[PDB]
């Protein structure tokens, strides 16, 4: 697998409904959906070590992990969590998250490299799955 690259979003589905389950009110949900249209992912993969930079027009954040090793990041609605990534297949990984403080919906994400050169990311809160599709810049 070579997830490394500069990825630009081409399609984003069910993001508003994800934010709804996480308790974001409607006006901010719409504003967030609009930001998701301009959002980019930079990945550097070496073996099973990943550096991921997620950026929008005004915000950037870095995620660093090695597959199978616990790390700390934040949920989609911004709460800190402990995360653990495992492979599901040659080109798909899955992340399970656990809140450090409090309760909330069960969240997770996945990344997949398709045979067509697309990157598919999903983010889940309970029953609702957001699917986002990227191509290399
Ligand atoms: C492997 C990829 C990961 C962990 C990507 C995570 C992406 C996000 C947490 C994106 C969040 C967004 C917002 C909370 C507001 C709207 C724009 C997004 C999609 C960048």
Curated annotation (Swiss-Prot):
Q: Could you read off the lineage of the organism from its UniProt record?
A: Eukaryota, Metazoa, Chordata, Craniata, Vertebrata
> What subunit structure does UniProt give?
Interacts with RXR and RARA. Interacts with importin alpha.
UniProt xrefs under PROSITE patterns: FABP (PS00214)
GO terms assigned for molecular function: cyclin binding; fatty acid binding; retinal binding; retinoic acid binding; retinoid binding; retinol binding
What protein is this chain from? Cellular retinoic acid-binding protein 2
Q: Name one GO biological process term.
A: fatty acid transport
> What are the inducing conditions?
By retinoic acid.
CDD domains, sorted: CRABP2
- What is its biological role? Transports retinoic acid to the nucleus. Regulates the access of retinoic acid to the nuclear retinoic acid receptors.
- Motif mapping: Nuclear localization signal: 20-30
Q: How is it modified after translation?
A: Sumoylated in response to retinoic acid binding, sumoylation is critical for dissociation from ER and subsequent nuclear translocation.
Keywords assigned: Cytoplasm, Endoplasmic reticulum, Isopeptide bond, Nucleus, Retinol-binding, Transport, Ubl conjugation, Vitamin A
Q: What does the entry list under GO cellular component?
A: cytoplasm; cytosol; endoplasmic reticulum; extracellular exosome; nucleoplasm; nucleus
Domain of life of the source: Eukaryota
Subcellular localization(s) per the UniProt record? Cytoplasm; Endoplasmic reticulum; Nucleus
Q: Does the keyword Endoplasmic reticulum apply?
A: yes
Please report which protein family the annotation says this sequence is part of: Belongs to the calycin superfamily. Fatty-acid binding protein (FABP) family.
An example of a Pfam family matching this protein is: Lipocalin
Q: Which organism's genome codes for this protein?
A: Homo sapiens (Human)
- Source gene? CRABP2
Record remark: domains? Forms a beta-barrel structure that accommodates hydrophobic ligands in its interior.
- Principal localisation: cytoplasm
Q: Where is this cross-link: Glycyl lysine isopeptide (Lys-Gly) (interchain with G-Cter in SUMO)?
A: 101
